[PDB]
């Protein structure tokens with residue numbers, strides 16, 4: 001039980017959960033940019049709240065936010081796909097995303113990942129902690145003090161590992177399976193990079209915020 005957490009870890013989890021919970025053709029794509037813009041704003045507010053984030057150098061703060069935006073977007077998308085989208089609309093979502101321009105070439109691993117995540121049946125607590133862990137990655141491009149980020153990420157990993165034992169005691173490889181998904185998640189940085197290239201070749205245009213956060 002959550003009695004397994006120290007009061008300090010309990011407080012940290014409560015903080016994270018409270019903040020996590022405070023979150024046609026060419027028109028289709030416009031809808032996706034709008035969704036992405038909206039998520040970015042949510043991601044900034046969650047990011048700012050992470051424990052110790054404020055003790056990080058400002059430039060490192062920014063690089064963590066930029067570095068994690070795509071991984072975070074896909075992790076939140078997996079959550080929506082599994083926890084919010086009726087299974088019966090699954091096909092609709094995919095068909096519409098196809099018709100936005102995005103080719104099934106990279107739509108395929110996207111939905112595979114969503115279903116992969118679904119198979120782990122992650123709790124909201126795991127989604128919240130994974131997101132925080134994604135954001136606090138010490139090995140992001142351009143980070144100056146990786147030690148300090150590693151130091152903020154460590155306690156979150158500890159809490160998540162305890163939560164894995166707690167939610168699936170008889171499945172000891174669960175924590176590792178989650179790390180496994182973090183690997184699969186990271187492949188989307190390249191996928192998205194490919195995507196923005198093509199999009200910008202077809203002159204897709206973007207909001208200034210997305211231009212900044214996605215390096216277009």
Ligand SMILES: CC(C)OC(=O)C1=CN(C(=O)c2ccc(OCCCN3CCOCC3)cc2)CC(C)(C)c2c1[nH]c1cc(F)ccc21
Nearest residue numbers: 032033035036037039073076077078080081084085086097
């Ligand atoms: C986190 C936000 C929502 O996701 C996004 O913005 C992206 C979401 N993608 C999703 O596959 C996705 C989108 C919507 C979803 O639910 C829509 C239905 C919401 N339920 C309906 C039932 O009642 C609960 C809410 C789930 C996954 C990935 C992808 C790559 C397509 C994409 C997103 N934006 C973009 C901006 C771009 F220019 C180019 C591509 C994207």
